[PDB]
Design an enzyme around this catalytic site. Structure first.
Site, short mmCIF file in Angstrom:
data_model
loop_
_atom_site.label_atom_id
_atom_site.label_comp_id
_atom_site.label_asym_id
_atom_site.label_seq_id
_atom_site.Cartn_x
_atom_site.Cartn_y
_atom_site.Cartn_z
N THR A 16 5.92 5.76 2.62
CA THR A 16 5.49 5.52 4.43
C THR A 16 3.77 5.93 4.00
O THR A 16 3.44 6.36 5.35
CB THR A 16 6.22 5.88 5.65
N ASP A 39 1.64 -14.66 -19.46
CA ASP A 39 0.14 -14.14 -19.72
C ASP A 39 -0.04 -13.75 -21.25
O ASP A 39 0.24 -15.22 -21.49
CB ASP A 39 0.48 -12.42 -19.26
N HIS A 69 -3.09 -7.40 -22.25
CA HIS A 69 -3.05 -7.46 -20.05
C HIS A 69 -1.65 -7.67 -20.44
O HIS A 69 -0.92 -6.87 -19.32
CB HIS A 69 -3.99 -8.34 -20.05
N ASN A 161 -9.86 -11.74 -8.48
CA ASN A 161 -10.73 -10.42 -8.45
C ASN A 161 -12.12 -10.76 -7.90
O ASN A 161 -12.88 -9.84 -8.29
CB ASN A 161 -10.51 -9.47 -9.44
N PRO A 175 0.35 -22.28 -0.73
CA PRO A 175 1.01 -21.95 0.02
C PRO A 175 2.67 -21.23 -0.56
O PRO A 175 3.02 -20.13 0.07
CB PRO A 175 0.69 -23.22 1.09
N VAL A 177 3.79 -19.72 -2.98
CA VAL A 177 4.20 -18.76 -3.44
C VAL A 177 3.88 -17.83 -2.93
O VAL A 177 3.25 -17.40 -2.37
CB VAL A 177 3.67 -18.94 -4.65
N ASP A 200 -0.59 -12.65 1.15
CA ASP A 200 0.89 -12.04 1.93
C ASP A 200 1.52 -11.48 2.14
O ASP A 200 1.90 -10.57 2.46
CB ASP A 200 2.10 -13.21 0.49
N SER A 224 -4.05 -8.21 -10.79
CA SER A 224 -3.22 -8.67 -12.12
C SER A 224 -2.37 -7.52 -11.72
O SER A 224 -0.97 -7.46 -12.24
CB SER A 224 -4.11 -8.77 -13.57
N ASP A 260 -2.01 -0.21 7.38
CA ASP A 260 -2.05 1.04 6.92
C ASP A 260 -2.78 0.85 5.83
O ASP A 260 -4.04 1.97 5.50
CB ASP A 260 -0.09 1.50 5.78
#
Length: 279
Positions: A16, A39, A69, A161, A175, A177, A200, A224, A260
Site C-alpha cells: 500500500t 514479443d 526485450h 511510450n 477497449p 483488453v 485501465d 513494455s 496514489d
C-alpha cells in the site's frame, strides 16, 4: 511468502506504500496458469525460468530471442527472482524480429495463434497474454486483440511510450483488453507513459530489473515493462480463484491502489496494480 531485496516493482505491487523492497505473495504463485509472451521470443534456457518457459511459435528463421526485450518481459511475468507469478508456465510467441520490429499482419497472426494454441496446453487456472508492443491505430490489430480476449485469454497490452493519448495506438486503444500505463518507484507517472481514457491500470515501468539474453539481467524502462507486471498479476489472481480471464482487468482495477500516482492527466485512471495479499 516473502522475497527479500526484490525489484522495486514487485515490492510495489504487494504494498500500500512506495519505498519498500520485499515482495509478498501467496505461495501458489500462479501454478496451473499459463502466460503467453508475444514479443521477440524468450531465452527459455535462462536459469531464472527453471524449465517453465518454452517457445511455441515463431514467424522468423529462429525462435530464439536475439534482442532481449521478450526475455525481459517474460522475466517480469514469471522468473524466479524477477517475476510476479513465479510458478506460472511461460509460452513464447515470436512476432517481433531481433531488432524488435514486426509487421501488423504477423502480430495479428500471433494473437489468433494464441487463441487457438491455448487448447493445446494445460492451463487449468487460466490463460493470460502479455503484449509489450504496438504502433499506430489499426482497427484490424484492435480486433485481433479483442478476439484473443473473447476466446478466454486475459489480454494485457502496453499503453505505449509516446507521452500521448493511447487512443491513437494499437492494440492499446482496444477497449476490451487491459491497457497498461507505467509508473516509477516514487509513484509518479513514468515520463514516457501514454495516458488517456483507454488506460485501465498502471504498473511499475521505470527502471525494472529482469532477465536478459545470454543468461544475464538488466534494468530497462517502458510500458513494455509495466504490462508483464499486470499479466503476471492476472495469472496469480486466477490461480487463487479470485477472478477469471474475462473479469481480471476489471478486478485488478477494483482492487488497485487508488489516487496514489502523481502527474496523472485529468481523465486518466489513477489506479496502480496491487495484489491485496495479506501475509
Amino acid at each position: 511468502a516473502a522475497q527479500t531485496n526484490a525489484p522495486w516493482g514487485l515490492a510495489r505491487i504487494s504494498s500500500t506504500s512506495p519505498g519498500t523492497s520485499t515482495y509478498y505473495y501467496d505461495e501458489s504463485a500462479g501454478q496451473g496458469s499459463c502466460v503467453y509472451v508475444i514479443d521477440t521470443g524468450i531465452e527459455a534456457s535462462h536459469p531464472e525460468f527453471e524449465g517453465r518457459a518454452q517457445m511455441v511459435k515463431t514467424y522468423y528463421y529462429s525462435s530464439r530471442d536475439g534482442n532481449g526485450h521478450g526475455t525481459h518481459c517474460a522475466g517480469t511475468v514469471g522468473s524466479r527472482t524477477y517475476g510476479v507469478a513465479k510458478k506460472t508456465q511461460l509460452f513464447g510467441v515470436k512476432v517481433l524480429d531481433d531488432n524488435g520490429s514486426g509487421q501488423y499482419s504477423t502480430i495479428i497472426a500471433g494473437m489468433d495463434f494464441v487463441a487457438s494454441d491455448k487448447n493445446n496446453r494445460n492451463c487449468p487456472k487460466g490463460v493470460v497474454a502479455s503484449l509489450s508492443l504496438g504502433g499506430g491505430y489499426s482497427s484490424s490489430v484492435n480486433s485481433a486483440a479483442a478476439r484473443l480476449q473473447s476466446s478466454g485469454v486475459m489480454v494485457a497490452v502496453a499503453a505505449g511510450n509516446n507521452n500521448a493519448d493511447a487512443r491513437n495506438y494499437s492494440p492499446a486503444s482496444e477497449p476490451s483488453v487491459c491497457t497498461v500505463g507505467a509508473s516509477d518507484r516514487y509513484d509518479r507517472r513514468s515520463s514516457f507513459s501514454n495516458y488517456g481514457s483507454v488506460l485501465d491500470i498502471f504498473g511499475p515501468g521505470t527502471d525494472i530489473l529482469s532477465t536478459w539474453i545470454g543468461g544475464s539481467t538488466r534494468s530497462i524502462s517502458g510500458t513494455s515493462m509495466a504490462t508483464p507486471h499486470v499479466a503476471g498479476l492476472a495469472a496469480y489472481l486466477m490461480t487463487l480463484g479470485k477472478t477469471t480471464a474475462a473479469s481480471a482487468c476489471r478486478y485488478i482495477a477494483d482492487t488497485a491502489n487508488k489516487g496514489d500516482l502523481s502527474n496523472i492527466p485529468f481523465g486518466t485512471v489513477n489506479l496502480l496494480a496491487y495484489n491485496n495479499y495479506q501475509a
